[PDB]
Amino acid sequence: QSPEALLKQKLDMCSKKGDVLEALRLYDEARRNGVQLSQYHYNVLLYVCSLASSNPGLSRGFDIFKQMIVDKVVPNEATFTNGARLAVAKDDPEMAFDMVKQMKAFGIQPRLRSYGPALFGFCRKGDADKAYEVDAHMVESEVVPEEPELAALLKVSMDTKNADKVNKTLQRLRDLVRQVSKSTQDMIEEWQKS
RNA sequence: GCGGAUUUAGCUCAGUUGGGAGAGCGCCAGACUGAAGAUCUGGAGGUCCUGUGUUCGAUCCACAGAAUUCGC
C-alpha cells in the first residue's frame, strides 16, 4: 500500500470526525517525509481548517493554502470555496469575494456554495452595496440562489431601508422557492405591515 | 399513456446511515492425481445504466432521462 493512499484514508477520517489537530499533524508528517500531496488531500485539509464553532487550524489554513500553489497542484472548485470559508472566519468577506473572483480566472465554474461565505459575510456586516455586488456576480456566473441566499439579500436591504431592492429580491424569491420557511415568512410580513 | 420495482465482474446476485465494493459460478494458474472430477489456495476480471446536482468526498443522497419488468 502506497503512503499517498495511506495518507488519504486517515485524512478521510479526520474530515469525518473533525480532528483538525490530526489533520494538521498528518500533513506536516507527510511533508517532512516528502509524501506527494494530492488535490484531494489539500481540500480535505482546508475543509477541516474551515470548520467553525475557536479553531486551531484557522491560521494554518492559509499556510496550507500557500503551500499548494507553490507546490503547483491544480485547484478545484472546492479549493477556492474552502479557501473563501477561511477568509470569512477572519472577518474578511472581501477576501472571500476575492476567492470567487480568482476561480473564474482559472476556468473554474462557481457553485452556489462558493458564494455563501462572501454573501452571508457582507450581509452580517451590514454592507448592502457589497452584498449586491456578490449577487450580481452570481447572476453573471449563471448561479441561481435559493431561500437562504435570497432571505439574506432580503434582510440586508430592509435593514438599510432599501424598499426598492426588497421588492425585486422578493420577486425572485417568489419564482424560485414556492414553500418559504417560517423564519423568512415572518420576516417578509413584518416589513410589509411596517 | 399512468403507476411501482429493478440497473453493481462474462452469468446469478449480494452490500448499505457516504471516505477505493464483494460473494457464488465461470476463466486462467497453483495444488492434488497415472490421468480426471471433486475438495482446497491464489490471480486476472468494473463507465457500480446515463445526465444534471448536494457534499471536503457519492455505487449509496436529490431531480430528470433511458432500458427492463409487473399491474391499470
Swiss-Prot record:
Belongs to the PPR family. P subfamily. The keyword Magnesium applies. PPR repeats lie at residues 3-37, 43-75, 76-110, 111-145. Disulfide bonds: none annotated. Its main location: mitochondrion. GO terms for biological process: tRNA 5'-leader removal; tRNA processing. GO terms for cellular component: chloroplast; mitochondrion. Keywords: Chloroplast, Hydrolase, Magnesium, Manganese, Metal-binding, Mitochondrion, Nuclease, Plastid, Repeat, Transit peptide, tRNA processing, Zinc. It comes from the Eukaryota. This is Proteinaceous RNase P 1, chloroplastic/mitochondrial. The keyword Nuclease applies. Endonuclease RNase P responsible for the 5' maturation of tRNA precursors. Preferentially cleaves at the unusual cleavage site, but also able to cleave at the classical cleavage site. Also involved in the maturation of mRNAs in mitochondria. GO terms for molecular function: metal ion binding; ribonuclease P activity. Disruption phenotype: Embryo lethality when homozygous. It is found in: Mitochondrion; Plastid, Chloroplast.
